[PDB]
Coordinates of C-alpha atoms and ligand atoms in Angstrom, one line a residue:
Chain M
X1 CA -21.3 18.5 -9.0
X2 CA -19.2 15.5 -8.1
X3 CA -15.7 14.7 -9.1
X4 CA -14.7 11.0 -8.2
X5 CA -10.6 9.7 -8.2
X6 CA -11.0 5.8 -8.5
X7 CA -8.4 3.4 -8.9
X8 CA -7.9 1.0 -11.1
X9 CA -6.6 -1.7 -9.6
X10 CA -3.8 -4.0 -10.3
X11 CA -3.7 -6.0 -13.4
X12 CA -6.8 -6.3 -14.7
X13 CA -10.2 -4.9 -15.6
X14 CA -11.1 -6.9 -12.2
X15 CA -9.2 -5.4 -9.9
X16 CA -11.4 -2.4 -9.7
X17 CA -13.5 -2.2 -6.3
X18 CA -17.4 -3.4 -6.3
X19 CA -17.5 0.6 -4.8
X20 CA -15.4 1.9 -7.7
X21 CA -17.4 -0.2 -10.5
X22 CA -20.5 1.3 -9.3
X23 CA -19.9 4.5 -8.9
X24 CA -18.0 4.9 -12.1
X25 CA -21.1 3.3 -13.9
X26 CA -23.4 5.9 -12.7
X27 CA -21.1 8.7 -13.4
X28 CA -21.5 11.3 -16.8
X29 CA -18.3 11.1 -18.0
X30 CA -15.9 9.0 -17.0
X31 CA -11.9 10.1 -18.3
X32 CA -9.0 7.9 -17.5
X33 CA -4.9 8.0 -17.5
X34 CA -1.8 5.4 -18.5
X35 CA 0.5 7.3 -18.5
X36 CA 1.7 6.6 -15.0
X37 CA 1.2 2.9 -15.8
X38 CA -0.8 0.9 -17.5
X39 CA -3.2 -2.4 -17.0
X40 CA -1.4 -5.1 -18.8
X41 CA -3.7 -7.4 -17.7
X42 CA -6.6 -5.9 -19.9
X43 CA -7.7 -3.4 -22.5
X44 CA -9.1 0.0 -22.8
X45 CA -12.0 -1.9 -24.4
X46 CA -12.3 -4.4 -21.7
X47 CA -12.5 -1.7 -19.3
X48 CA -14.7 0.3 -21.4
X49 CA -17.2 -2.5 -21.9
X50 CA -17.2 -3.5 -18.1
X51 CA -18.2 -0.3 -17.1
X52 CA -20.3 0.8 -19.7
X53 CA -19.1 4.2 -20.1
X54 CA -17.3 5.7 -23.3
X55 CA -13.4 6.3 -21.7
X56 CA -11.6 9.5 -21.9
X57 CA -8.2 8.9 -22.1
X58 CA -5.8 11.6 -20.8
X59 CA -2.3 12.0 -21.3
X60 CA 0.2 13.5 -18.8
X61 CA -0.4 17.1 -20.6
X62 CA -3.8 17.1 -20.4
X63 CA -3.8 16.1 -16.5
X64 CA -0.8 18.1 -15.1
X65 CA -1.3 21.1 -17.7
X66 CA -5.3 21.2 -18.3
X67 CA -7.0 19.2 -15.5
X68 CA -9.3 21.8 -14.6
X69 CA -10.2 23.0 -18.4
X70 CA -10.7 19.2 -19.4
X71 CA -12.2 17.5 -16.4
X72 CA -13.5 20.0 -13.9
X73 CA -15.7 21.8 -16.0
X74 CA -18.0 18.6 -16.5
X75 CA -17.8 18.4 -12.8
X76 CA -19.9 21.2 -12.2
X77 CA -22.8 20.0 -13.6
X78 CA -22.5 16.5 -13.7
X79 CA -20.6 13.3 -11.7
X80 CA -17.1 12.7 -13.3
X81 CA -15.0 9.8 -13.0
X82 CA -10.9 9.8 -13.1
X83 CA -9.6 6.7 -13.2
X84 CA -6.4 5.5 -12.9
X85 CA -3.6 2.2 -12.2
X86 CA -3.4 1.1 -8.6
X87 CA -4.9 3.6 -6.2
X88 CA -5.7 6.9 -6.3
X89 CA -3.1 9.6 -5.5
X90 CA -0.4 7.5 -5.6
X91 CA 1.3 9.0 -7.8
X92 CA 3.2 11.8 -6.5
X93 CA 1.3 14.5 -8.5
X94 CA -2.2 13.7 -8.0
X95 CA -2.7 14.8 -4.6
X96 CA -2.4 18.1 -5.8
X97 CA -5.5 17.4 -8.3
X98 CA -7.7 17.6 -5.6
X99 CA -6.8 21.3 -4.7
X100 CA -7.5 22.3 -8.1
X101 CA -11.1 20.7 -7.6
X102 CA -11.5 22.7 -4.4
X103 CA -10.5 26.1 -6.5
X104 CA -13.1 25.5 -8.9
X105 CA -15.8 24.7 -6.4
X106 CA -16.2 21.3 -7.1
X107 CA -16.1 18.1 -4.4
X108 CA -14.4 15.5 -4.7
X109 CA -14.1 12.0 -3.0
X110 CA -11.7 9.2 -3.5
X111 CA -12.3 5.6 -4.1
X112 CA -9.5 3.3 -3.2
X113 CA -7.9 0.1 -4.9
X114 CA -5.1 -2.0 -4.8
X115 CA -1.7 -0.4 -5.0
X116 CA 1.3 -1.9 -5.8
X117 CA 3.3 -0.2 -2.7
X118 CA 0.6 -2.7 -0.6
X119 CA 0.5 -5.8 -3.2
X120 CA 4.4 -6.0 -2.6
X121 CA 3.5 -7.6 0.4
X122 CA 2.9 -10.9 -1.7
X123 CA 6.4 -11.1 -1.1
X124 CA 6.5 -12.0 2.1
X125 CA 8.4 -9.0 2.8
X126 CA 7.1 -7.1 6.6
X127 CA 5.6 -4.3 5.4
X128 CA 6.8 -2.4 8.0
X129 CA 10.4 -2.6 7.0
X130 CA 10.5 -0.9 3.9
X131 CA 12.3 2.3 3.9
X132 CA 11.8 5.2 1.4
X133 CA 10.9 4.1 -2.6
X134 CA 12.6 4.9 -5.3
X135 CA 12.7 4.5 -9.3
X136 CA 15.4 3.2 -11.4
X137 CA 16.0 5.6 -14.2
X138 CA 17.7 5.5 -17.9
X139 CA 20.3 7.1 -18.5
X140 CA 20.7 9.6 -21.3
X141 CA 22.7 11.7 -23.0
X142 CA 25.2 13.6 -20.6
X143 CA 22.7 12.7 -17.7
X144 CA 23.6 9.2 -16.0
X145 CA 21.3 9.7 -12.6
X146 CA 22.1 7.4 -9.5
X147 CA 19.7 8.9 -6.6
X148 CA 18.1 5.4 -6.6
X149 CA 21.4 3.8 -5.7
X150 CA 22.0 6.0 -2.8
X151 CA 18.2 5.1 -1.4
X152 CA 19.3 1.3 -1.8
X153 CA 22.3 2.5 0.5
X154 CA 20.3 4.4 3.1
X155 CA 17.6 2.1 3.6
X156 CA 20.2 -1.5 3.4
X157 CA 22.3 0.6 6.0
X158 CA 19.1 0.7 8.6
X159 CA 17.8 -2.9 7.7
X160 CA 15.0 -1.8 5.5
X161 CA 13.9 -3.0 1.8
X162 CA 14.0 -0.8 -1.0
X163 CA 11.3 -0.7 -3.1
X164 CA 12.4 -0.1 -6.7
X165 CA 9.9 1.0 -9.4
X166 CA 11.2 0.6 -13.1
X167 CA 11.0 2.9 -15.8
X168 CA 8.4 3.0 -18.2
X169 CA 7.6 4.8 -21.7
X170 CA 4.1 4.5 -21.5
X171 CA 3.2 6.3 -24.8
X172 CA 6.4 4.2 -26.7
X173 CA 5.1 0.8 -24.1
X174 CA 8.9 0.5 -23.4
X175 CA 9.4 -1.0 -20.1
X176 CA 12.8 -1.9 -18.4
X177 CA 13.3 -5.3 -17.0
X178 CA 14.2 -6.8 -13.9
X179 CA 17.4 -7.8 -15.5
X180 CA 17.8 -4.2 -17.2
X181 CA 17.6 -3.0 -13.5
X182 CA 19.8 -4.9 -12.5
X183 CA 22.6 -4.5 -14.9
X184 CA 22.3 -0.4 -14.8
X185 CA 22.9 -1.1 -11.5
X186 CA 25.9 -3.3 -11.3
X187 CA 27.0 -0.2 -13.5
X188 CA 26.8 2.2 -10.9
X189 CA 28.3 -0.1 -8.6
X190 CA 31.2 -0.1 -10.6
X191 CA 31.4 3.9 -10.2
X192 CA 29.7 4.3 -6.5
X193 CA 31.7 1.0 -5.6
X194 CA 29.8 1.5 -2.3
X195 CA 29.2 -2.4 -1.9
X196 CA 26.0 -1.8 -2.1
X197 CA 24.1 -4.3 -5.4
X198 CA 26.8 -6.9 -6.3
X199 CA 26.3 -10.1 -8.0
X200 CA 26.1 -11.5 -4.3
X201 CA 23.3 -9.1 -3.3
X202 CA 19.8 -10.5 -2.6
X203 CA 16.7 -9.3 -4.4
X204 CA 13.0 -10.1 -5.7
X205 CA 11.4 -9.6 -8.3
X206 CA 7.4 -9.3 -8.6
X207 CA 6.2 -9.4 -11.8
X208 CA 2.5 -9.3 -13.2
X209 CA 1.4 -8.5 -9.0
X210 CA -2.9 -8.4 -9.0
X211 CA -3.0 -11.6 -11.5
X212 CA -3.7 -15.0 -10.2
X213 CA -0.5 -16.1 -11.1
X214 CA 2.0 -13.9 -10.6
X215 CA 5.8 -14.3 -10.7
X216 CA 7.8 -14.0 -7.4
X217 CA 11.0 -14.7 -7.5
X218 CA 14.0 -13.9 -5.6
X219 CA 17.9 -14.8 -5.6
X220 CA 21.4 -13.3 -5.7
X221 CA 21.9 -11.0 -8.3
X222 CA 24.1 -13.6 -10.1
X223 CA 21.5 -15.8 -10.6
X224 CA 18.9 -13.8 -11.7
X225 CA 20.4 -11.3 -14.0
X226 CA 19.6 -13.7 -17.2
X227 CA 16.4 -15.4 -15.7
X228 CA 13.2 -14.9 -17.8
X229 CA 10.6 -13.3 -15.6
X230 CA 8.2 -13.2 -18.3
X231 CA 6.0 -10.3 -19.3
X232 CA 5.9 -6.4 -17.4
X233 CA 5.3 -5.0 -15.7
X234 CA 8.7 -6.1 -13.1
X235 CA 9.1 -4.8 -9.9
X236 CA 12.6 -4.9 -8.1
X237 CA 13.1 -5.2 -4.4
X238 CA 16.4 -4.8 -2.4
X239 CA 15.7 -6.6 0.7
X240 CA 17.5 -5.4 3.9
X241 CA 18.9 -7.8 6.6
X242 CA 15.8 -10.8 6.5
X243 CA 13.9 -12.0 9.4
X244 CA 13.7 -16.0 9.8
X245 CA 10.2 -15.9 8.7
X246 CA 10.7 -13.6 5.6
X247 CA 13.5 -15.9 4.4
X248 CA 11.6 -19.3 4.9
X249 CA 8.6 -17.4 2.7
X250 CA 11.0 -16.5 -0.4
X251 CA 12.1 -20.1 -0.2
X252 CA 9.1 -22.0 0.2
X253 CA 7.2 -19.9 -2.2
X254 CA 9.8 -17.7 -4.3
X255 CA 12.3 -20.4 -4.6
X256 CA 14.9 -18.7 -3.3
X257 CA 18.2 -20.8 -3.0
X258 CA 18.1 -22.3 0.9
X259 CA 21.5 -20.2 1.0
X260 CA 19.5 -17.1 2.2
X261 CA 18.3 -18.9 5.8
X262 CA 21.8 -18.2 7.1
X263 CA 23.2 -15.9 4.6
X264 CA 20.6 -13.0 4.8
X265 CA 19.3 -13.9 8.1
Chain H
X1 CA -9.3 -27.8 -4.1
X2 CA -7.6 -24.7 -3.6
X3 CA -7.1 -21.9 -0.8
X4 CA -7.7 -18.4 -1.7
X5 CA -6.8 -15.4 0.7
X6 CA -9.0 -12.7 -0.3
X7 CA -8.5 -8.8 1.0
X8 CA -12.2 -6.8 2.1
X9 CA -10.4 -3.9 1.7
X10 CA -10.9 -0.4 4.5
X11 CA -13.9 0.2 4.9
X12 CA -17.5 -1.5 4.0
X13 CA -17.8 -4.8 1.8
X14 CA -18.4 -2.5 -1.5
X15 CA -13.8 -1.8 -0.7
X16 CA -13.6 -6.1 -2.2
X17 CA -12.1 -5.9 -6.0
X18 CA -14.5 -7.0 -8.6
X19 CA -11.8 -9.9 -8.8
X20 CA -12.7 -10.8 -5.0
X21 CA -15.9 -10.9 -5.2
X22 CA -16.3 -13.6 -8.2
X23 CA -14.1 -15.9 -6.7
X24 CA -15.3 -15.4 -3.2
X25 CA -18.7 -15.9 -4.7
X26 CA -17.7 -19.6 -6.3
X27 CA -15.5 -20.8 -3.2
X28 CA -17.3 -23.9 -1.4
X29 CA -16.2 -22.8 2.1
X30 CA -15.6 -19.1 3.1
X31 CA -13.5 -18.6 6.6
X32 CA -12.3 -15.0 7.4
X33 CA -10.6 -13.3 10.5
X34 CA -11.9 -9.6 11.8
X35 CA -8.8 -9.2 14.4
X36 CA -6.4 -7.3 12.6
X37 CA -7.8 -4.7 11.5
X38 CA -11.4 -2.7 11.8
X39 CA -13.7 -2.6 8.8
X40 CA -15.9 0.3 10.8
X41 CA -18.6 0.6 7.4
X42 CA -20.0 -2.8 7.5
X43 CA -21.2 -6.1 9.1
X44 CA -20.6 -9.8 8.7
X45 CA -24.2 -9.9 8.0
X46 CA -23.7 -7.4 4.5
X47 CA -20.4 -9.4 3.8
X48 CA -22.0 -12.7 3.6
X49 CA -25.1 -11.3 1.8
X50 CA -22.8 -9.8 -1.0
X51 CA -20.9 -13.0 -1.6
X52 CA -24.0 -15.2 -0.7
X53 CA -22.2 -17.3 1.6
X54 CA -21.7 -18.0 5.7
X55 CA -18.9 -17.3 6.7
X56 CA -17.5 -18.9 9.6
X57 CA -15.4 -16.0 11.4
X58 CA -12.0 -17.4 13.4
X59 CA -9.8 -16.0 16.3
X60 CA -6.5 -15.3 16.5
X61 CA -6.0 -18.4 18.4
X62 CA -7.9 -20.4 15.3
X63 CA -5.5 -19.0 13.2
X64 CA -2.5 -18.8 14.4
X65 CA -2.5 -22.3 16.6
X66 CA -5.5 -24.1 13.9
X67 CA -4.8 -22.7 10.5
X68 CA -3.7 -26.6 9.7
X69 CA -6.7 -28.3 11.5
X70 CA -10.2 -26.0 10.5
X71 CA -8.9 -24.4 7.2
X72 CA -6.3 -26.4 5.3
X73 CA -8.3 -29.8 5.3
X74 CA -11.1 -28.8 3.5
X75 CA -8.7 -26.8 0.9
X76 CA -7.4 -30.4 -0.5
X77 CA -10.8 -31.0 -1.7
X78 CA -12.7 -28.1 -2.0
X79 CA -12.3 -24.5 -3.1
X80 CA -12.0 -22.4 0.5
X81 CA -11.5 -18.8 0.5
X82 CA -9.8 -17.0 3.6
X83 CA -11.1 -13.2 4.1
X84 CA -9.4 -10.4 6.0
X85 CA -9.8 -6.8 6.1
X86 CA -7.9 -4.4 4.0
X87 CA -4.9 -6.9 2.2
X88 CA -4.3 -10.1 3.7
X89 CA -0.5 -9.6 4.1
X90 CA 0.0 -5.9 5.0
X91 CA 0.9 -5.3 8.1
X92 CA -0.3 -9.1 9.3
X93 CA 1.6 -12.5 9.5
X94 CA -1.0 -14.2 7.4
X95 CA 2.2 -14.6 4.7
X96 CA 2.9 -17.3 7.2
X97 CA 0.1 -19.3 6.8
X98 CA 0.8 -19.5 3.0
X99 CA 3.6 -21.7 3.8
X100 CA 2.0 -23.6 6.3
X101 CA -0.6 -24.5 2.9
X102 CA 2.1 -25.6 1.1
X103 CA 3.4 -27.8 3.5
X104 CA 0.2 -29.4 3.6
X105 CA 0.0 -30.0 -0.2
X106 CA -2.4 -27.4 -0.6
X107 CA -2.2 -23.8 -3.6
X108 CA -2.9 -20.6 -2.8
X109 CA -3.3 -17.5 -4.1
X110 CA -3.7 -13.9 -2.7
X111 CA -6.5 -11.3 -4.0
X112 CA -5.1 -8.6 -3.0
X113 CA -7.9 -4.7 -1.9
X114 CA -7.2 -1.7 -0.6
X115 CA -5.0 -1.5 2.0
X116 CA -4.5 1.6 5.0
X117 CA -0.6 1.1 3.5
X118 CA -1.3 2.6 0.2
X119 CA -4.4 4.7 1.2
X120 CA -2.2 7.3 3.1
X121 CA -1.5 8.5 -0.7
X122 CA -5.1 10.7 0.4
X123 CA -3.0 12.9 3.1
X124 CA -1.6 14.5 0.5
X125 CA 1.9 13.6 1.5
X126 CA 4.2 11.6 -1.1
X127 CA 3.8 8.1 -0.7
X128 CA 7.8 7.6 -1.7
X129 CA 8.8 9.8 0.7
X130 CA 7.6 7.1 4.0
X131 CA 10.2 5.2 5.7
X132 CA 10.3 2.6 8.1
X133 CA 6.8 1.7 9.8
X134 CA 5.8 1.2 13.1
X135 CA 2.8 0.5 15.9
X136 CA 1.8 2.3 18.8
X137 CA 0.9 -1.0 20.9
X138 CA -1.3 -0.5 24.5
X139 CA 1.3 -0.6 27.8
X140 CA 0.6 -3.7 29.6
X141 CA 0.8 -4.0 32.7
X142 CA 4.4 -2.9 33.6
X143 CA 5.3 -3.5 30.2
X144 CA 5.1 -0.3 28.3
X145 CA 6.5 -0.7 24.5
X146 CA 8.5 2.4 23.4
X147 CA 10.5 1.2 20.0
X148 CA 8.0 3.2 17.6
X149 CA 9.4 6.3 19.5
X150 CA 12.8 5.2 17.8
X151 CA 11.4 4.8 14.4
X152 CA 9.9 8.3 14.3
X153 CA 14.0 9.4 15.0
X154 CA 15.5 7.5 12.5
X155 CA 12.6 8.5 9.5
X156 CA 12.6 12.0 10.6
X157 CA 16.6 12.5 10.9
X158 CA 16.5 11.3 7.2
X159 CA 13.4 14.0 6.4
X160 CA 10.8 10.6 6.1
X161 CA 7.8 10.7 6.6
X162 CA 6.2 7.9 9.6
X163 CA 3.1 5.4 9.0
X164 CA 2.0 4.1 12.6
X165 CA -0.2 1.9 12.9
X166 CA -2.6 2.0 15.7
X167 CA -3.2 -1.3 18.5
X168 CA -6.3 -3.2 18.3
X169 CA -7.6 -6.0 20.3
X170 CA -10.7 -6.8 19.1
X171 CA -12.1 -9.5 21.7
X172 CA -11.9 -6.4 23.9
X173 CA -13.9 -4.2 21.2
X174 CA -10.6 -1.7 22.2
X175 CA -8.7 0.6 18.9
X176 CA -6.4 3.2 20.0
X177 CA -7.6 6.3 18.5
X178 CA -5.1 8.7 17.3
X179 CA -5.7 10.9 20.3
X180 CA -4.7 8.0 23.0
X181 CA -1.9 7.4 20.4
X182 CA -0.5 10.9 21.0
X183 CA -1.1 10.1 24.4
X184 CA 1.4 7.6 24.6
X185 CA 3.8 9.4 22.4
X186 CA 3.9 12.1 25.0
X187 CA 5.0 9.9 27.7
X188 CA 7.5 8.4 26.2
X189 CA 9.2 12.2 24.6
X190 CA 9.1 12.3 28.6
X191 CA 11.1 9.5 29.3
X192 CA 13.8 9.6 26.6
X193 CA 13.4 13.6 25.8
X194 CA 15.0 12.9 22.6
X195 CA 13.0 16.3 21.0
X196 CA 11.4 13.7 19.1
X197 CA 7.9 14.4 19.6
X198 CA 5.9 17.2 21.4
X199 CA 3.1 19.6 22.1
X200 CA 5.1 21.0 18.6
X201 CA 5.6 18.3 16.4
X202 CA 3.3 18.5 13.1
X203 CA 1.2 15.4 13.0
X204 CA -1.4 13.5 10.2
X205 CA -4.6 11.8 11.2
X206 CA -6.6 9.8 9.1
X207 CA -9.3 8.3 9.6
X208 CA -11.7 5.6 8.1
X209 CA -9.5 5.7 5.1
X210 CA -12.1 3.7 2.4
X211 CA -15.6 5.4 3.4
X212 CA -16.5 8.2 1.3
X213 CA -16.0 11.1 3.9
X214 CA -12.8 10.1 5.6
X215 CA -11.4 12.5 8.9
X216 CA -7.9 13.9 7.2
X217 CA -6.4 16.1 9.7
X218 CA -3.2 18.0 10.1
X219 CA -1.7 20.0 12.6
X220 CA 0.3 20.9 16.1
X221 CA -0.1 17.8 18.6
X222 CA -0.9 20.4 21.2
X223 CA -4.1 21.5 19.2
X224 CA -4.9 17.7 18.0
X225 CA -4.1 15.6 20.7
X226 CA -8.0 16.6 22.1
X227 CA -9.4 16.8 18.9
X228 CA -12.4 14.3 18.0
X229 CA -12.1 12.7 14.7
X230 CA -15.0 10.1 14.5
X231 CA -14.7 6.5 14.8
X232 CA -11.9 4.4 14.7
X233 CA -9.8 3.1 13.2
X234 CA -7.1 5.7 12.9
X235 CA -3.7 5.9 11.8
X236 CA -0.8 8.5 13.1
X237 CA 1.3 10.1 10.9
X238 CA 4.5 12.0 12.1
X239 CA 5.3 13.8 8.8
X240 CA 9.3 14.9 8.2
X241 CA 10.6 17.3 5.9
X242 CA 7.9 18.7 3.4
X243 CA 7.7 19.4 0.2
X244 CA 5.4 22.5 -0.6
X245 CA 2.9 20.9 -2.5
X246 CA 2.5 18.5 0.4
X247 CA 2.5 21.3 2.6
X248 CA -0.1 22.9 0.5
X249 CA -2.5 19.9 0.0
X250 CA -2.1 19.8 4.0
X251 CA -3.0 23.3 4.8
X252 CA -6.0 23.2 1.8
X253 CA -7.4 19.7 2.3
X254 CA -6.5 18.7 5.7
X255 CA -7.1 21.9 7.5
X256 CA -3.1 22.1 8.6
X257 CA -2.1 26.1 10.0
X258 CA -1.6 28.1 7.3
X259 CA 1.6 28.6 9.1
X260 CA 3.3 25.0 7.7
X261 CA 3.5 26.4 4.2
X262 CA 6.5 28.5 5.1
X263 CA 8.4 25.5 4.9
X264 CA 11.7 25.3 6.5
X265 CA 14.6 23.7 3.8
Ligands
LIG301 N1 -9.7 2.3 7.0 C1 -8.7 2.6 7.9 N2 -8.6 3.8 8.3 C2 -7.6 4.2 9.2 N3 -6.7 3.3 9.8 C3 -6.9 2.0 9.3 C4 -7.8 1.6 8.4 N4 -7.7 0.2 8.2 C5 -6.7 -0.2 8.9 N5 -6.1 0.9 9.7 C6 -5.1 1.0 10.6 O1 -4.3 -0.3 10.6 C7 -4.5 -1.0 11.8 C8 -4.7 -2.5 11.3 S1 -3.2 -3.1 10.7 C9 -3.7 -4.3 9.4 C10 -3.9 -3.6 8.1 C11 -4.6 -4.2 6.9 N6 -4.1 -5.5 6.4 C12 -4.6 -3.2 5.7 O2 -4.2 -3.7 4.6 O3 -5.0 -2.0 5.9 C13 -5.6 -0.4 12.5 O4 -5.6 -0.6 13.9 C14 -5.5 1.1 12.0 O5 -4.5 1.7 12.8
LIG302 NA1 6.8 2.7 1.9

């Protein structure tokens, strides 16, 4: 009679919670989702095999559209597992899953984990300072969307970083670069020319966040636009105005050019 | 001879990733802090019975005065792990110390858990939509700290929603509930009458984000502000402009008046 959101994690079969392993190991069913990301640390099958449960995958149809004719039903009866990337509810249509579970009469509790909005923090960036998120897009056809550049602009314009998710084709495993990001936008700069991301505009880039090694670098836009990152998934950050300590922490550990200590401070 | 800094996570020592706990478990010499945040669902007793170790637990003097002199010196010749609750670098300066290792010709590397940061995806609001972050900190003395009042302003003018972190002084046993938070709000709408918040503003509480059965309330400040929601620690949310299905998830999950659905755009 128990419906249980658990996260995933990171990177890695690992990342999961000691709370969330358990739990999702005594559950009846256990279903799971990659379409809002994926574990490119792992497999399906390493997943699987660690928590010894056969794995439902759902695609986004199945959870926006058929949630509660797919996974509540089971719910009534017996416990059911959800799992998904980074932590529960996250992403910005989940939430509402739990409604659903209410209509149908059935309870459900959430089991936290890792989340890259929290992991960014790796960065040395103050938590605190980050302003509203955004994702950077591709364009297509007739539609060339630039909302994300305009959050860049609000946040920069207040001293806050941006945090900039990239886009993803999870079914197609397509993922956009750093250095994709960055040159869509040096494209809308050329249209927007609102000084806002220029080839002398500081950012970071995270990359492979939840591993033991993960990349973290950051540098003018210049500099990084050709760099090899390595694999996805990449996160992009627009740092706002730094604060001594920040700076010192992107050189010392990001290898930021010493240029940024009186630069970007 | 290596320095890990490991993340507990919110709420009990079952919140650790799997990831954690393997490490944690292999580390000659386990140190760990309990002063920036409140782990309210377990013990240092269950903590070091789960990883099988003693853990010697530091101050905030220790830390951020020793770091270099009780830590770092066993790290260049054995494996030490560092433990915090929630992440190690959310809302903390424990970023710091990473450079402080490096100086001393010593590797880390960050596990990262669930943090309070990411775990506010369970109020139901979008976790894109949060701007800049803030802490309600204890008046001292004469001193009474007002620039979260500012931070509510600037988010809510641009329809953000605001995290605030609550004050904690744990040699004292003292976290501000969301209640005393409120508190303090209501003074200081009384000094700078800004209309920023009162006895009408719409306000989020969560609290004990990580145990199973978490307090997630929403409503008037007014009808909250003498509520009781259970033990600390608590967070404060001052929502901005809502989206209906946030609204919704509010009024459904977190008890909000049915009245916040008719939402004003
Ligand atoms: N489980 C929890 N529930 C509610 N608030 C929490 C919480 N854990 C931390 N907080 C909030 O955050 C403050 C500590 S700030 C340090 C946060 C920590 N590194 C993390 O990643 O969560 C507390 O005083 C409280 O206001
Ligand atoms: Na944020």
């Amino acid at each position: 009679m128990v419906l249980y959101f658990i996260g995933l994690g990171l990177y890695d079969e690992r990342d999961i919670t000691v709370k969330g392993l358990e739990i999702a190991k005594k559950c009846d069913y256990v279903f799971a989702e990659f379409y809002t990301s994926l574990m490119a640390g792992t497999t399906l099958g390493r997943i699987q095999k660690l928590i010894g449960k056969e794995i439902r995958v759902l695609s986004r149809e199945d959870v926006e559209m058929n949630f509660e004719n797919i996974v509540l039903p089971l719910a009534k009866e017996n416990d059911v597992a959800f799992l998904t990337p980074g932590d529960p509810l996250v992403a910005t249509t989940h939430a509402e899953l739990r409604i659903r579970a209410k209509r149908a009469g059935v309870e459900s509790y959430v089991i936290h984990a890792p989340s890259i909005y929290s992991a960014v923090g790796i960065t040395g960036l103050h938590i605190y300072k980050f302003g509203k998120s955004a994702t950077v897009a591709y364009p297509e056809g007739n539609w060339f969307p630039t909302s994300y550049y305009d959050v860049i602009k609000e946040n920069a314009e207040r001293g806050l970083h941006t945090l900039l998710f990239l886009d993803i084709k999870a079914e197609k495993r397509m993922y956009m670069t750093a250095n994709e990001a960055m040159e869509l936008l040096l494209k809308v700069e050329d249209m927007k020319k609102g000084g806002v991301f220029t080839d002398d505009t500081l950012v970071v880039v995270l990359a492979r966040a939840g591993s033991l090694n993960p990349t973290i670098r950051a540098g003018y836009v210049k500099d990084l636009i050709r760099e090899d990152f390595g694999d996805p998934p990449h996160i992009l950050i627009v740092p706002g105005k730094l604060h001594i300590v920040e700076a010192e922490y992107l050189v010392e550990i990001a290898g930021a050019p010493r240029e940024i200590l009186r630069v970007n401070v």
